[PDB]
């Protein structure tokens, strides 16, 4: 039956995952071993099996973003030296931890907005990614916010950002490129729908006629 | 055979966990049910089992910090209405996500320190806890930092904090009650050994004669 193990586990190692058993203990003594990537081919020895007990262990932390599944085969051999069964497939699923912060595709996004743009007009878009597991978890679920605006004139909150899409809009009036030529917004992306790990970048908006 | 499920999974629900079998299905219909806290006692219906297929399922997201291990029992009953097995114990392990910030044990810690205190002199100790899995993960592994000091004289950094223990110490010279009787530090606790979710509190230090 399929086995799962979280990434990034603390020691001590090794750690038991499951005990393999041949119904062919009828033959007395069986010796167990495993093959596959993560066993006897690279990366070698991430999993091992106790020869006599059949205990299948993990020997170090896993990393879902590097390898997310392993396919091993367990072998069972008599003391006279013959395989007593065909190799049995084992499937190991690495489950995700929130160990990647969202990462903005650029450090500085640049856009422009026209004087007299209607309140509610889209201006530009910022984008972050998150390497964590977006299928099974919220570890990659990104909310966008604005942290600050420089300058704070003529109003402190000239703009808003859609917390899902990262589209920035102008939401009030009084753009004037001859007094305040640009706006520099610090934007944040945070996973767990905004409550999780975060980073920031900058969006710089040029005011046009 | 031992089963696990991450907390806080996305749907859709329900999700298959494992299929229970009796080798008594040779004879005819077996009907499957489960008892225990999480099944028929509180919280009720978190796990169900398909009567015919014996597919054990989970019906909603789990919260490890509510219940981290469930002990259920599977029952198997002939279509004529007799138990064809002893009830069989099922252990479900709920594996952790980092969804709890550290939390200081109080919002304001107090300490005092002689103005004639040598650099390296312990002043006080702040303390946080984290409800996540401190045994298997780093999701509750807290690192303490200082974020701010007030006032910022005679130096901005009159104190340092032990990353691991939260012990605060005098780091430099010039403690003087009459000029500055009171320092107010903002301290922070963050999990994943400092890289993770974070909270802040305050330490208020009095300079004594
Ligand atoms: Ca990882
Ligand atoms: Ca991850
Ligand atoms: Ca993430
Ligand atoms: Ca939880
Ligand atoms: Ca935590
Ligand atoms: Ca948790």
Curated annotation (Swiss-Prot), chains A, B:
Annotated site (Cleavage): 206-207
Glycosylation (residues): 122, 127, 200
Modifications made to the protein after synthesis: During apoptosis or with calcium influx, cleaved by a membrane-bound metalloproteinase (ADAM10), PS1/gamma-secretase and caspase-3. Processing by the metalloproteinase, induced by calcium influx, causes disruption of cell-cell adhesion and the subsequent release of beta-catenin into the cytoplasm. The residual membrane-tethered cleavage product is rapidly degraded via an intracellular proteolytic pathway. Cleavage by caspase-3 releases the cytoplasmic tail resulting in disintegration of the actin microfilament system.
Inducing or repressing factors: Induced in the hours following cyclic mechanical strain in keratinocytes. Expression is repressed by MACROD1.
Effect of residue 178 to D: In DGLBC; likely pathogenic
Tissue: Expressed in granuloma macrophages (at protein level). Expressed in the skin (at protein level). Expressed in the liver.
Binding site for Ca(2+) 1: 99
Compartment(s) of residence: Cell junction, Adherens junction; Cell membrane; Endosome; Golgi apparatus, trans-Golgi network
Effect of residue 86 to G: In DGLBC; likely benign
Effect of residue 17 to D: Reduces localization to desmosome cell-cell junctions. Also reduces the localization of DSG2 and DSP to desmosome cell-cell junctions
Residues annotated as domain Cadherin: 1-104, 105-209
UniProt superkingdom: Eukaryota
Role of this protein: Cadherins are calcium-dependent cell adhesion proteins. They preferentially interact with themselves in a homophilic manner in connecting cells; cadherins may thus contribute to the sorting of heterogeneous cell types. CDH1 is involved in mechanisms regulating cell-cell adhesions, mobility and proliferation of epithelial cells. Promotes organization of radial actin fiber structure and cellular response to contractile forces, via its interaction with AMOTL2 which facilitates anchoring of radial actin fibers to CDH1 junction complexes at the cell membrane. E-Cad/CTF2 promotes non-amyloidogenic degradation of Abeta precursors. Has a strong inhibitory effect on APP C99 and C83 production.
Entry comment, domain topic: Three calcium ions are usually bound at the interface of each cadherin domain and strengthen the connections, imparting a strong curvature to the full-length ectodomain.
Disease linkage: Diffuse gastric and lobular breast cancer syndrome: A cancer predisposition syndrome with increased susceptibility to diffuse gastric cancer. Diffuse gastric cancer is a malignant disease characterized by poorly differentiated infiltrating lesions resulting in thickening of the stomach. Malignant tumors start in the stomach, can spread to the esophagus or the small intestine, and can extend through the stomach wall to nearby lymph nodes and organs. It also can metastasize to other parts of the body.
Protein name: Cadherin-1
Designated gene of the protein: CDH1
Full-sequence range covered: 159 to 367 of 882
